[PDB]
Design a protein around this ligand. Structure first.
Ligand SMILES: *[C@@H]1O[C@H](CO)[C@@H](O)[C@H](O)[C@H]1NC(C)=O
Ligand SMILES: *[C@@H]1O[C@H](CO)[C@@H](O)[C@H](O)[C@H]1NC(C)=O
Ligand SMILES: *[C@@H]1O[C@H](CO)[C@@H](O)[C@H](O)[C@H]1NC(C)=O
Ligand SMILES: *[C@@H]1O[C@H](CO)[C@@H](O)[C@H](O)[C@H]1NC(C)=O
Ligand SMILES: *[C@@H]1O[C@H](CO)[C@@H](O)[C@H](O)[C@H]1NC(C)=O
Ligand SMILES: *[C@@H]1O[C@H](CO)[C@@H](O)[C@H](O)[C@H]1NC(C)=O
Ligand SMILES: *[C@@H]1O[C@H](CO)[C@@H](O)[C@H](O)[C@H]1NC(C)=O
Ligand SMILES: *[C@@H]1O[C@H](CO)[C@@H](O)[C@H](O)[C@H]1NC(C)=O
Lengths: 299, 50, 250, 50, 50
């Protein structure tokens, strides 16, 4: 006989709400992966991808890439997720060095011409180019830096051509002992070994939300229903709760609000710039008040 | 106790939904386990003090 | 000369809305009551080091200060970010600029002498048209315009706030938070910078401070505006305030 | 409590400086996390008993 | 009884594999040892993993 707390009532959502920016443009991935000329790794290109609808299933499922490795994100979730900006770092490297384009890795390339952050979120995409970039008599248009005074911080582009002083002797452009150039090249030939063939590598740097999003996956939006418990998705950030009107004056640069626990407090709708409070739908403990089962089974 | 929900405990993010919405199962289960261990420890500390 | 930085150099660390809460964050902020150098442009525009981020502020009445130059050698041998405000369109370029012997935007305007060559350029941006002050005027200044310029892992982040003032001698006493405005992905190793003054001489002043990694306790009011702040390394009392996460100590 | 500083808790070494001086960041952070978990648990046990 | 330099062997682009346990390849310049032993032999390629 007594009162026991046995379970928890939680209202379930009735319908889903999927919200994304109302953009009718496709992201120009073809002009980057299928390009006439790639930049050298010492002077790698960084193209900004923004204000468009992307589709990462085509690039992932296509059986043409030599490598497809993602950090922070998983390749099958990119269709749901959306970003404020995407940057494509495009350059050619030697095959055995593909392993060096990574956070936490070291070497002469990772430190001198293309360094990644150790918290990098995004994907390293690579494929061989033995039938496009390599030539007979070798390809000498690809230069990388062999010597640097210091090691690169993440995403620095050291385009300098200053002559290296391998000793205390000032060089001023002389090519002798203790005076070498930092620029060296590969001779890519169709007859060279696998590890010595050119590879075209594009690193996709993804910036999670912190501002209005412009590059979102291929997912259609739905209508928004207020004052009901719903399973919502606002620019890829999902959760369950009741969406209500609010009096919170967000500044033009603020997109999301947060509570003490870092959960979302309110969101600004990406299509109509209004603030919706998110209050998780009503819940509570369920207790059973009962006489002992030796008397009655009524509760 | 509430402030502890903001901690990462070694995970990529303190928000469970943000982990689940970007990574698939295999590694995500590891990231979730990190948060479960930390948050469970937080509750045990709270209960002991109470 | 130099002056005492009176409650300045605080910006919103991110773009998340919070209200009626004191939130503790560690980032590169201008320390409270630190010393900031006072420059004059009557009867200059020297080169200062760029390091760990720079706080810049100016008080204007005739838009004398119109731009900034950032880089390492500033002599066409390395990449250098150039920001120019030419009264109509804001122009941002990342080129290996060959700079003039004395860069300036002189007066209406018929001289554009800040550089001479722009080769091997990797980025250009132009904002919308507008109109700005271009006449040489005098009097008490009307608008104090504060900026923060910092470079983290190749992203050049610019924060700013414009506010009316009525004060010429020094910084107004009061409190005001700086919102973010621009984030430029450039990837350039910046060690020095220079400002650009409009010369007819001028009569305006500007301030240069430097950022350090400090922990701040930021007070967001009911309207989500930062209304106060504690520099957690300013003094033992501020340290106490940080430990208790409160602005009142029993 | 002091004796607990001598425990490895699954790490290659109980001495934090000996881990940091021989391994670079990526795996070292894992080895350090093992010691942090063990030593933090040791303090919680001490405080609870006190 | 000598001064070693492990940066030359590590940075040289001639080795098929370079895998270290207990130590990290960039710390070997700082670290020092009582003795080093070099076990030298020829194996078949597919057995390198063994
Ligand atoms: C923006 O979203 C609304 C939602 O109904 C849609 O009607 C409108 O056409 C969208 N804008 C564009 C340019 O398609
Ligand atoms: C690149 O070209 C090939 C064939 O020319 C095509 O199948 C592939 O989809 C293209 N890539 C992109 C990203 O459009
Ligand atoms: C940036 O340039 C300065 C020269 O003023 C140099 O000392 C520093 O090492 C450079 N940074 C890097 C990462 O090389
Ligand atoms: C509870 O059940 C036992 C066994 O059936 C019975 O002997 C006892 O009297 C019951 N208690 C009450 C209050 O009826
Ligand atoms: C700033 O420096 C100047 C000279 O270096 C000095 O006279 C002045 O008192 C200093 N102010 C503060 C607040 O330290
Ligand atoms: C200021 O310089 C920019 C640089 O391109 C130019 O576009 C703009 O028209 C100039 N404004 C003038 C001359 O008023
Ligand atoms: C710019 O790139 C060209 C490419 O041919 C190169 O010759 C030149 O030296 C580089 N630097 C400058 C300052 O033009
Ligand atoms: C918050 O904004 C409202 C807008 O009407 C204003 O009346 C109120 O005074 C603001 N809060 C404070 C503390 O001033």
């Amino acid at each position: 006989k007594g009162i026991y707390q046995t379970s928890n009532f939680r209202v379930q959502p009735t319908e889903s709400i999927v919200r994304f920016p109302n953009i009718t443009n496709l992201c120009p991935f073809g002009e980057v992966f299928n390009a006439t000329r790639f930049a050298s790794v010492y002077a790698w290109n960084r193209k900004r991808i923004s204000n468009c609808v992307a589709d990462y299933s085509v690039l992932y499922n296509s059986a043409s890439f030599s490598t497809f490795k993602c950090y922070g994100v998983s390749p099958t979730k990119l269709n749901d997720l959306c970003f404020t900006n995407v940057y494509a770092d495009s350059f050619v490297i030697r095959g055995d060095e593909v392993r060096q384009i990574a956070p936490g890795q070291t070497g002469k390339i990772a430190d001198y011409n293309y360094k990644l952050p150790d918290d990098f979120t995004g994907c390293v995409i690579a494929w061989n180019s033995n039938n496009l970039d390599s030539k007979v008599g070798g390809n000498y248009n690809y230069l990388y830096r062999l010597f640097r005074k210091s090691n690169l911080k993440p995403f620095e582009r050291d385009i300098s051509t200053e002559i290296y002083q391998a000793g205390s002797t000032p060089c001023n452009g002389v090519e002798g002992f203790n005076c070498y150039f930092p620029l060296q090249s590969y001779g890519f030939q169709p007859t060279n070994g696998v590890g010595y063939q050119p590879y075209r590598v594009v690193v996709l740097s993804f910036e999670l939300l912190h501002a209005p999003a412009t590059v979102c996956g291929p997912k259609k939006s739905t209508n928004l229903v207020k004052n009901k418990c719903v399973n919502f998705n606002f620019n890829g950030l999902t959760g369950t709760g009741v969406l209500t009107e609010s009096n919170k004056k967000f500044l033009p640069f603020q997109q999301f609000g947060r509570d003490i626990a870092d959960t979302t407090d309110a969101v600004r709708d990406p299509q109509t710039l209004e603030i919706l409070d998110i209050t998780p739908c009503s819940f509570g403990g369920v207790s059973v008040i009962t006489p002992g089962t030796n008397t009655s089974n009524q509760v | 106790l509430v402030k502890q929900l903001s901690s990462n405990f070694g995970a990529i993010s303190s928000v469970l939904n943000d982990i689940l919405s970007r990574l698939d199962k295999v590694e995500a289960e590891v990231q979730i386990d990190r948060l479960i261990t930390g948050r469970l420890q937080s509750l045990q500390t709270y209960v002991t003090q109470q | 000369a130099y002056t005492n930085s009176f409650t300045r150099g605080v910006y919103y660390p991110d773009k998340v809305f919070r209200s009626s809460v004191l939130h503790s964050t560690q980032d590169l902020f201008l320390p409270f009551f630190s010393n900031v150098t006072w420059f004059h442009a009557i009867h200059d525009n020297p080169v200062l080091p760029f390091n760990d981020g720079v706080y810049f502020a100016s008080t204007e009445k005739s838009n004398i200060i119109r731009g900034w130059i950032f880089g390492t050698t500033l002599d066409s041998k390395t990449q250098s970010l150039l920001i120019v405000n030419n009264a109509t369109n804001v122009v941002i370029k990342v080129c290996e600029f060959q700079f003039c012997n004395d860069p300036f935007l002189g007066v209406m305007e018929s001289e554009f002498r800040v550089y001479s060559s722009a080769n091997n350029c990797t980025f250009e941006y132009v904002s919308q048209p507008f109109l700005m002050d271009l006449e040489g005027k005098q009097g008490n200044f009307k608008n104090l315009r504060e900026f923060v310029f910092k470079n983290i892992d190749g992203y050049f982040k610019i924060y700013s706030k414009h506010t009316p003032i009525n004060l010429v001698r020094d910084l107004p006493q009061g409190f005001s938070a700086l919102e973010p405005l621009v984030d430029l992905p450039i990837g350039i190793n910046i060690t020095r910078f220079q400002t650009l003054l409009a010369l007819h001489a001028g009569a305006a002043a500007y301030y240069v401070g430097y950022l350090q990694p400090r922990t701040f306790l930021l007070k967001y009011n009911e309207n989500g505006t930062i209304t106060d702040a504690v520099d957690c390394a300013l003094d033992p009392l501020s340290e106490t305030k940080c430990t208790l996460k409160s602005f009142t100590v029993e």
